């Protein structure tokens, strides 16, 4: 269903990444010279911060300047809505591509395909140019994008482009600030491949943990200090997985990069991305 009040679609996990990339590039938009992907929590609980607002505005400006693609949750919650709003604001002052991958199963309204349009769980933001919904089933709405998104990023990483130097490749930077658990899994899978994720030691909890770290007791104390209620609600079994993912992330530091809180410069975002690449 294509909706204009942009393009939308329903996806299956078995769909090949190469076919999706061919569709995207050939049909609609230009080749990507950069793939800044923001990972955060889908929960609506996103306490807006002043420095975070400035940082994300700078990130959007950089993405527009370089022509980068932006991949987000695209569910109109917390940081998602603001990261789309900055794109709108820049679009009203030569275009920004803000693909958003969400889950069909978790979506509330169903508008089957010509250009069916509806206005208004997990309603989806319409402020993103392109939306990709993937759910082979399971109306219970378990996360499904956590695989297709990573596969697409990896395939585009291997995609060779003879531009922007970088050895005929694409930057594919991985911005991470949210304190979600799925953010931890996303960071782990991103670092599994040679994707230079970058974190900021700001409001993010799972992000501040990694920023401070860069043993089991160390991880436990850090996550208790930064996520006391979350760890209290978390079961014992999940703690083993959390510690394992944290150890995997801290294993490699050449890919992971951090942003200091002291740095108040205007171009700290660009400095972090450039140093990571």
């Amino acid at each position: 269903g294509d909706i204009q009040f942009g393009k939308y679609l329903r996806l299956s996990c078995d769909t090949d990444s190469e076919t999706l990339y061919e569709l995207l590039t050939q049909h609609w938009h230009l080749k990507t010279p950069n793939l800044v992907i923001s990972v955060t929590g889908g929960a609506k609980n996103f306490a807006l911060k002043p420095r975070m607002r400035k940082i994300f505005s700078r990130l959007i400006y950089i993405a527009q300047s370089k022509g980068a693609w932006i991949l987000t949750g695209g569910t109109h919650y917390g940081l998602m809505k603001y990261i789309g709003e900055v794109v709108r604001d820049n679009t009203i002052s030569e275009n920004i591509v803000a693909i958003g991958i969400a889950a069909w199963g978790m979506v509330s309204n169903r508008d089957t395909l010509f250009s069916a349009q509806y206005i208004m769980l997990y309603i989806l933001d319409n402020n993103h140019t392109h939306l990709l919904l993937v759910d082979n089933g399971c109306h219970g709405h378990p996360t499904v994008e956590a695989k297709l998104r990573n596969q697409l990023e990896k395939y585009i990483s291997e995609r060779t482009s003879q531009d922007s130097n970088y050895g005929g490749k694409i930057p594919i930077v991985c911005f991470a600030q949210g304190g979600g658990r799925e953010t931890l899994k996303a960071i782990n899978t991103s670092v599994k491949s040679k994707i230079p994720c970058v974190v900021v030691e700001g409001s993010g909890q799972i992000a501040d943990v990694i920023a401070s770290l860069v043993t089991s007791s160390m991880v436990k104390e850090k996550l208790v200090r930064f996520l006391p209620r979350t760890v209290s609600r978390l079961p014992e079994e999940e703690i083993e997985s959390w510690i394992k993912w944290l150890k995997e992330i801290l294993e490699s530091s050449h890919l992971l990069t951090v942003i200091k809180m002291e740095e108040a410069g205007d171009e700290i975002v660009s400095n972090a991305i450039s140093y990571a690449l």
Partner: peptide, 10 residues
């Protein structure tokens, strides 16, 4: 045009 390709692809 494109929509027809989407039919089979997706």
């Amino acid at each position: 045009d494109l929509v027809n390709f989407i039919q089979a692809n997706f």
